[PDB]
């Protein structure tokens, strides 16, 4: 496999470079601390916001097409199930709503900072908090959207056979949506103390 | 995981196939069809089912058990071809491999008719229209297996399945066509099992591996029992006829190859518990069909699995068989064994 | 005759909208010439859009005559 | 060359403008291809639904409109001497709209293929297909909205 | 007086018909002509093919099959079918017509059977004549080939379809090894065949071989693949002689085919002038017996007992109509109408006008309401177009939508008269829907000051720009007043236009979603009051009402209050409402900014109210059910309802932001389209400027009417559908109601 060979070559190159820097006495030259301190926190904040909304939308679309394919497939014989299983698509799109809300909240903290206070403690904390909270919300919404889409596909296929299946698989779908809700809660909690760039 | 990547290409296929499964007749509908009086009443009862008005064009006097079977089979094959024509890639290859099993039976039936010199129209009618390679009607004349292969089988996707049949005599008879069918279908089973293992993903991979193992065991038992009555069977040559992908392989298949008596066959099958009771008592084919229906029902429990297509196709083929049996019993009015149908839904 | 109806409707909407736009340009409307990015010369753009609206009026009357017959 | 306005700052704006159209076009192309396969499959059996079933292709193309809009609006604030804050704002907006449009186009393609294949058999499924396609397109709309929110802050209080 | 059942379903009474068999057919005719009775399936206990009128339904089904076969013959032998007189039966309303007699139906059945026999005989004769003529035509073509075609028994020259010519070529190659001389030509004209009733293109072919066993081998191979083989004299003189044999027998066969075809088309044209009326009569005769099939016939007596679902309003009309039928027949009968009081579920029927029909189609696509349940189609009439307008928000695009809908509304008589397609029947039954959406979109665009993405400076702006400033200098306007109607036009083109419009639209969405939710939730109270479900009021309404008015009603009140306080003038800092909402749950009792005195006390009180109402709503109704195996089902269902309620509270309030999202998207696309299409044309001047202006305006109008008015007005329409089906109906729509499908006669297209 070309991808596996590329991964192995990258690992070997990284190990060789690290050993070369360490053995020669320049091991501290591979400094992640200086990389994080000298990196603009605007980069972290904007990447966090963009990845939050992007991964939330990716998860929403993932669940949407998984559920919609099954809804249309099972609707050929039972068209009555589309309107009743639209709740599954609603539960898939609510994660995109969550990502949009988190993106709005984080973008409210995108203020221009002065040159002297560019990499201050508060600014660096804001950048890290926005980046990681956006990553958390986006990945949680992606995972929740995929799970809710799988559950909704099963619910549509099962309630095509008998309508009593939907009222019992909606519980599992609500359990799935709880994951996205908790992801939003944690993402807000991380950025609660992160003040605007100053 | 299972359903993360399935619905990209096979979500619609799975939904429609499981709706078709929902359309399978239940026990209550089977009983209602059993309580019919005439074939017209059977058609009217089937109208209320998910068959719809498939016999609407058929007149009352034209309504016959053979024609009912023809229309039910035509509807089933139209559904299967529609499902295949909406799928691509691994699913399309899976459907083609499903069709190859009927195609082998079609070529065997055509050759049997060719030596038997039966009526061409009835020979074409009896053939399964799912497995149809373009040179299939050519089979009504071709007899030599070398000429067979070079002029027909290389063209068909059955070419990889014809490897070791050149050893036998060039003249072809009923025994030759039977052994050629067995060898071809064994090679097809090996190729299909390999395709399922490599390309078909979990959980459809394991489910269809189990289903193909059951099919291989079934045909191994059938081949052993059909060759037991014949005295020209070689124990080592029979290994080329018994499939090697089933649960019987390798010990039970070896014992079956060395088996020469019905008690010997039972001792060979003593390795597996499921198949012991099948020969212990009762109708063997009835037990095979019942366990096949049970396996199809178990296959339909798994979601985001393409094995549900195979489970559906076997289930509705059995459903068409049951409809034909009920129609024949009603037309002949011999309802002593009218309730001898196999259903799990 | 569907093309004639489509062109008649489009040309009538042109005669309305472009005439309104040219009137707003001629009066030096804030929303149209009130920014440095917006065109500096008001009357020139007003005359250009007057000519465009006259072209659309010619199209409108021609297509309406075609529809009427 | 200023600490606030590095020489690599325009790279982020330019690459965000490029990505805004690149990823939205990729998603729109996937949607168009899948929906075209579905439409051409169904039109052999039901040619009367040829123009009714083209909606998935239309809704896949709107994603390209969103990407084009973000690319056009990003070019407004592009410049040689632009701050790193503006560059990363542009990159974030472009990435947001691009990834959202890519996901939306993938979903629209898959659901539109399923819907066109299932509406020829069952005409009642056209409404459901349109609903799910709208649910897929509103995701690209949300990406557009996030891109616009980011862009609104691109050149405000920037020095 | 007929009740105007738009707020709730029409009141229904189950009516029992004591129809004797002497007038059973006429009674079924009159009941189907009325079209006000939804008959109950009284005879559902018995299985099929055993019911009272199974044989007579089967006879009419056979006649319908024969008529469908006649229609297939008319279609294959292309003939336009003459439509029947719809006005003869009035195709609707309560008017009664003279129905066909039983002798007329028997004559129809016998004529259909005899004429089917005649038509199948004639069709078989025509098919055999056509197939032999086709064989002779192929033989003529193969005789008409050039001399070089046969130069390269010695051959198997014949005709095969091009679908198999390659397969035949290759299989013959493999049969003959390297001794293949397969020369083939093509028949340019399409060849029609009666075996498959389709046209297949054929290719004449010839193969040269010598061996008798080989020549028979290849002949059988060719014959196997549906190829009509022919014999040729192998000489040019022989070919000429054989072709002279042809075109003379072909003349006789053409004459015979012409005579038979003329006779058969005469018969089919005779059918076409009367087939539609026969089909309508047979369909009505089958429908009346299918309805009569659902009757509890008494063997000892001669009375057909049938139960139907007629609204109480038309009960007197039905009694008068049945009395009129009795007077027409003159047969004396006992009391035929006897109103019943049962515990069944009556159907849900709402009387709709031409204006409310589309909105009720919208509200019934989701699901059918319960009997005497608060109709969701009455508030939809206004809410759905208004939510669409909030998302749409454009006075120019809204004007285009209004004109498009008015074109249908004013010309609705002609469109009703003419046939409509699937996309034309839709958007015409909802022409009033589109009209309301367009009018409300114009209103919202006025409130947004958005006319084709521009702004209207109708009134005096409340913002005053500085007295003087240098070009390119950032200037901030100072407040002088407030804009009377709509958003201020001084906000157009400003850098912080988005920062204001986004907050305005988000708070508008939150407020108009809270109001719409509470309006829908009060419909649950109306339903409970009508149904006398006081325990429902105590256990599901009051807890949920307190929950939403403490968690989300408080948010709306704070949003309104923050607008009514001059924070700059008062000196207090502006409290972030979103941070306040977050802190109301994630850190009770902590407020960074003081919106109003005793904010923390009220916030913790409302949080306690919600956290008390959650167990209230989860437990009180199951507790009442326990203290009046079903207890476990009720308890679990109440848990599911509670969890779904709490989740969809925040879910619905958050998803109402789609109004702001779509409004922003529409505004930005409109502005960007104006920038890329017309704003470019302004710079150019002269003849090229005029031409560019014309072309760019045409492209702008096309793109507008394509994506913004039509398609962006379709996304908002369907999103308002979603907000009504999910965010609004789930509040008060119990659903799972029986749709009203009365036994009415309609024109069934063939
Ligand atoms: C060639 O330019 C056409 C489309 C292009 C290239 C649009 C670009 C701007 C695209 O990049 C954008 C992104 C998408 C867009 C703005 C699609 C609108 C399409 C028009 O639709 C109004 C159809 C429409 C006229 C046509 O598709 C059908 C004939 C039809 O009218 C048939 C009707 O039955 C159906 C109800 C109707 C529906 C589906 C809209 O479409 O024009 C075209 O083809």
Coordinates of C-alpha atoms and ligand atoms in Angstrom, one line a residue, chain D residues 51 54-55 58 61-62 65, chain E residues 423 703 706-707 710, ligand 1:
Chain D
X51 CA -36.9 17.5 -15.6
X54 CA -32.9 17.4 -11.9
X55 CA -33.4 19.1 -8.5
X58 CA -29.5 22.1 -9.0
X61 CA -24.7 23.7 -7.7
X62 CA -25.8 26.1 -5.0
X65 CA -22.5 29.6 -5.4
Chain E
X423 CA -45.0 20.7 -11.4
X703 CA -29.8 34.5 -12.0
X706 CA -33.3 31.2 -11.0
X707 CA -31.6 30.9 -7.7
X710 CA -37.1 30.5 -7.2
Ligands
LIG1 C1 -28.6 26.1 -18.5 O1 -29.0 26.9 -17.4 C2 -29.6 26.1 -16.3 C3 -29.0 25.9 -15.1 C4 -27.7 26.5 -14.7 C5 -26.4 26.2 -15.5 C6 -27.7 27.2 -13.5 C7 -26.4 27.8 -13.0 C8 -26.6 29.3 -12.6 C9 -26.0 26.9 -11.8 O2 -24.6 27.0 -11.7 C10 -26.6 27.3 -10.5 C11 -25.6 27.1 -9.4 C12 -27.9 26.5 -10.1 C13 -29.2 27.1 -10.7 C14 -29.5 28.6 -10.6 C15 -30.0 26.2 -11.3 C16 -31.4 26.8 -12.0 C17 -31.7 26.1 -13.1 C18 -32.9 26.4 -14.0 O3 -34.1 26.2 -13.3 C19 -34.7 27.5 -12.9 C20 -32.9 25.5 -15.2 C21 -34.3 25.1 -15.7 C22 -34.8 26.1 -16.7 C23 -34.1 23.7 -16.3 O4 -33.3 22.9 -15.6 C24 -35.5 22.8 -16.5 C25 -36.0 23.0 -17.9 C26 -36.6 23.1 -15.5 O5 -37.3 24.3 -15.8 C27 -37.7 22.0 -15.7 C28 -38.8 22.0 -14.8 O6 -39.6 20.9 -15.0 C29 -38.3 22.1 -13.4 C30 -39.6 22.3 -12.4 C31 -37.3 23.2 -13.1 C32 -36.8 23.1 -11.7 C33 -36.1 21.8 -11.5 C34 -36.0 24.3 -11.4 O7 -36.2 23.1 -14.1 O8 -32.2 26.1 -16.3 C35 -31.0 25.4 -16.6 O9 -31.0 24.3 -17.1

